[PDB]
């Protein structure tokens, strides 16, 4: 624990500073240290954790896609052999990405999920588990690509089951979970019809519950509903 000597509260404070400075690797390391203090995370702290690692892995995924595209081109017919360098460097980025994903999955398994009893925390963490297995799936090609995909699906499914039982259809965590599970179906599991069906049902059931919300909750819910609609427009 490189952050083991820093107070939990100081780690959270510095995570917020790192965010303002757009230093997301630092933000992630501060939040990792905060999780490893062993106390449950508040709602704000959970979102600091997810924002930090989302930004880190998001940059890695963007770089991996650039490099994978170059690699695919250099492997086409008529291409000039430039040697092992493109593959080596894509592999380097891929390994770093897998390391970040394993770290996040490690925090969820030790011991954020098992200590999360409320729907709002348990669904949030299981959505994260699905998301980070999804990112591992995006780069997987070995004897365990199918097992990685099923690990993502399993986590997403447990989160959906809880969210449908315990949260209203407009809950932003429920909505965001369905958004991402829908993308999982479309992009990972090769189930575009399930992806479209999930996004549409999620949108329609949220629409019918908007009348119950305050202006501030309405804004939060309609924001994610628009992302569901955006994806449906991309897919139909």
């Amino acid at each position: 624990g490189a952050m083991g000597s820093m107070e939990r509260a100081s780690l959270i404070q510095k995570a917020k500073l790192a965010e303002q400075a757009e230093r997301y690797e630092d933000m992630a390391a501060f939040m990792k240290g905060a999780v490893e203090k062993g106390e449950e995370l508040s709602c704000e702290e959970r979102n600091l954790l997810s924002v930090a690692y989302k930004n880190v892995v998001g940059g890695q995924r963007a770089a991996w896609r650039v490099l994978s595209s170059i690699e695919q081109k250099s492997n086409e017919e008529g291409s000039e052999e430039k040697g092992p360098e493109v593959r080596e460097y894509r592999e380097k980025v891929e390994t770093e990405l897998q390391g970040v994903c394993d770290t996040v999955l490690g925090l969820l398994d030790s011991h954020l999920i098992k200590e999360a009893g409320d729907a709002e925390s348990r669904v949030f963490y299981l959505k994260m588990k699905g998301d980070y297995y999804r990112y591992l799936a995006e780069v997987a090609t070995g004897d365990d690509k199918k097992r990685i995909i099923d690990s993502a699906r399993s986590a997403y499914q447990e989160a959906m089951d809880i969210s449908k039982k315990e949260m209203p259809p407009t809950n932003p965590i429920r909505l965001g979970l369905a958004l991402n599970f829908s993308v999982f179906h479309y992009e990972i599991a090769n189930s575009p019809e399930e992806a479209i069906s999930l996004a549409k049902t999620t949108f329609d059931e949220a629409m019918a519950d908007l009348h119950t919300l305050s202006e501030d909750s309405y804004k939060d819910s309609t924001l994610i509903m628009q992302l569901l609609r955006d994806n449906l427009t991309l897919w139909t």
Binding site: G176, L179, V183, D230, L234
Partner: peptide
């Protein structure tokens, strides 16, 4: 790419 949060 499609939107995720």
């Amino acid at each position: 790419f499609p939107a995720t949060v």
